[PDB]
Write a protein that binds this ligand. Structure first.
Ligand SMILES: Nc1ccc2[nH]c(-c3cc(CC(=O)O)cc(-c4cccc([N+](=O)[O-])c4)c3O)cc2n1
Lengths: 254, 94, 149
């Protein structure tokens, strides 16, 4: 997170941290006790599929306190339309092995109802993104959780204001943009998968997932997020199906 | 212009250089105090007034709803949680 | 659907109307207005008018700067979305009531606790007059003088 502040321990309760072999992988969001949402590319180079764990309650990555809860990740389901290496359909649903215990430091984020997302959350200007990712384009990752408040833009104004190229994907209907273009504030490497949360009348819902669009805090660019609205249906359906036989699972999308 | 009383719903007209200004009453707006503020109770208009979800129905009022873990209250707009750690609430700021 | 163009703010004594083009053959328009950092509020839902009255909103903080956009939908599928799944729109110039509204004690469309405020209760010592009379707000860049009586 570039330009962010430290999240007052306990104010980001839906933040997950995924680990592989002990090393940080991505971030993720907790939508319910056994389900976490993250970013599909984080599973592009995983060949140690059982050495993947998720931590909740986490805050300061250097000391252990009485809060962190860790569960192995039993399954990882990605749209069957995601392409290994892209930013389109960058969403993953992770089924834990055992649920977590909600506590003051572990609560889920509401996965909003599509219509409400599209029609109401989407015109709430500011949302929060959080993580323990680099604090500057290529600087140190963080130890305490950092959260950034960004403004969202509609593709027309994003396209309108971005500089023209780099080997960029397009902002498809499965993405949106948020950020500043004066390379001051942005999500960054290490924040992948983490949340973009909108606060509407007292509750926070998951409006986006930190994807990897823009190396990190560039100029003339905005950060790109996966538009969750386009996937509520899909997630929901997956969350009620029988366990099926695979760690990585590529579910049909839509 | 004013002479030709263009302001409706109680509004007063003020003349200008051919133009006029209509001063409407609290429940109406528009150039000629004609739009009624209480006829746009739709889900696209400030979420229908619902705290969490809203639904518009054919010829009948829109209904508000709640997210899993909450119950709509008496007023039909506000939801309250029925659980301990209802989603999207931050226990330490509660 | 064509997007609106020539979005203009027409404002005198704070009565603020936005107008635009075209006049809509088989499409409807909805207008959203926000501040630099506010959420967007919608008005004139799915109309066929080419003018929207935003007074209600800009008189809340006449010193903020508002920006607005008009969305165009075909009529019927007023759900309409384009390639990036959002509805076609165009934005307006920024309008800072307090600095760009037009002038003509006088009442303004600004209201405080149910009542209306007056030219002076709104511009205090930034309002001077001339003698025939004209109203001038010297601390302005544009629309600094009114007309005369
Ligand atoms: N504003 C942001 C936000 C999140 C971001 N994540 C990345 C990111 C960059 C790389 C290196 C590259 O540019 O190829 C790798 C990952 C990455 C993270 C976890 C897992 C994998 N993976 O393929 O197994 C890649 C990034 O998230 C950039 C980036 N920028």
């Amino acid at each position: 997170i570039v330009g962010g502040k430290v999240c007052p321990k306990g104010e980001c309760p839906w933040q997950v941290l995924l680990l592989v072999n002990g090393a940080q992988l991505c971030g993720g969001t907790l939508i319910n006790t056994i389900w976490v949402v993250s970013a599909a590319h984080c599973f592009d180079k995983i060949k140690n599929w059982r050495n993947l764990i998720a931590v909740l309650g986490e805050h300061d990555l250097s000391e252990h306190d009485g809060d962190e809860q860790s569960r192995r990740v039993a399954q990882v389901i990605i749209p069957s339309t995601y392409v290994p290496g892209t930013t389109n359909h960058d969403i993953a649903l992770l089924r834990l092995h055992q649920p977590v215990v909600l506590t003051d430091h572990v609560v889920p984020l509401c996965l909003p109802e599509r219509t409400f997302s599209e029609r109401t959350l989407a015109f709430v200007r500011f949302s929060l993104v959080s993580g323990w990712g680099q604090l500057l384009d290529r600087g140190a990752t963080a130890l305490e959780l950092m959260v950034l408040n960004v403004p969202r833009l509609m593709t027309q104004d994003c396209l309108q204001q971005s500089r023209k190229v780099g080997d960029s994907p397009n902002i498809t209907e499965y993405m949106f943009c948020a950020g500043y273009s004066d390379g001051s504030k942005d999500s960054c490497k290490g924040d992948s998968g983490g949340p973009h949360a909108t606060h509407y009348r007292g509750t926070w819902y998951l409006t986006g997932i930190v994807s990897w669009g823009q190396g990190c805090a560039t100029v003339g660019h905005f950060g790109v997020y996966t538009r969750v609205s386009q996937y509520i249906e899909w997630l929901q359906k997956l969350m009620r199906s029988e366990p099926r036989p695979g760690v990585l699972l590529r579910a049909p999308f839509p | 212009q004013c002479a030709s009383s263009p302001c409706q719903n109680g509004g007063s007209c003020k003349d200008q250089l051919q133009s006029y200004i209509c001063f409407c009453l609290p429940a109406f707006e528009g150039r000629n105090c004609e739009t009624h503020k209480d006829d746009q109770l739709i889900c696209v208009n400030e979420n229908g007034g619902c705290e969490q979800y809203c639904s518009d129905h054919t010829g009948t009022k829109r209904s508000c709803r709640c997210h899993e873990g909450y119950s709509l209250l008496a007023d039909g707009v506000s939801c309250t949680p029925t659980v301990e750690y209802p989603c999207g609430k931050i226990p330490i700021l509660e | 659907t064509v997007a609106a163009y020539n979005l203009t703010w027409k404002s005198t004594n704070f009565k603020t109307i936005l107008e635009w083009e075209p006049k809509p053959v088989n499409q409807v328009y909805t207008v959203q207005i926000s501040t630099k950092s506010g959420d967007w509020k919608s008005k004139c839902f799915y109309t066929t008018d080419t003018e929207c009255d935003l007074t209600d909103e800009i008189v809340k903080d006449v010193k903020q700067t508002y920006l607005a956009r008009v969305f165009s939908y075909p009529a019927g599928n007023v759900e309409s979305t384009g390639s990036a799944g959002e509805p076609l729109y165009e934005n307006s110039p920024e309008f800072t009531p307090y600095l760009e509204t037009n002038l003509g004690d006088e009442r303004t469309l600004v209201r405080r606790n149910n009542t209306f405020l007056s030219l002076r209760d709104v511009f205090g010592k930034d309002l001077i007059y001339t003698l025939s009379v004209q109203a001038v707000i010297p601390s302005r860049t544009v629309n600094r003088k009114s007309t005369d009586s």
